[PDB]
Amino acid sequence: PVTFVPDTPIESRARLSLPKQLVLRQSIEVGVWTGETIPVRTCFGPLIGQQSHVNHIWKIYHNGVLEFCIITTDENECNWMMFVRKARNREEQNLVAYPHDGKIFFCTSQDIPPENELLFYYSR
């Protein structure tokens, strides 16, 4: 009898896009953790998600009008940044999330040692 060898399964786009210096593990529900030190002023982006002109919605304004929302729910429609959870307080927070040129970027507020969860808050 013949034995069958399957293809290597294909992971979702969100997962494949993950920077090698980061890992996915359960959040404080999947979250993004550091596999090594991430220096202050390290920037990630832009966010990729489903564009449409809950808890997973980014608002893009342009010249004072809400142009569209990015929704970050579907692993096939987003990059890895859909996995980054929102800090629950100002202590825990280590990424600032902000629009630039109509796209969302996350930037480290401080050096983040290995084995820390990435946790965002909005800029001012």
Swiss-Prot record:
Stretches assigned to the SET domain:
20-123
Domain of life, per lineage: Eukaryota
| Tissues/organs with expression | Expressed in many tissues. Highly expressed in ovary, testis, pancreas, brain, heart and prostate.
Locations listed in the record? Nucleus
What the record says about family reads: Belongs to the class V-like SAM-binding methyltransferase superfamily.
Job description of the protein: May function as a transcription factor involved in cell differentiation.
Protein name in UniProt: PR domain zinc finger protein 4
Origin species, per record, is Homo sapiens
Q: What is the lineage of its organism?
A: Eukaryota, Metazoa, Chordata, Craniata, Vertebrata
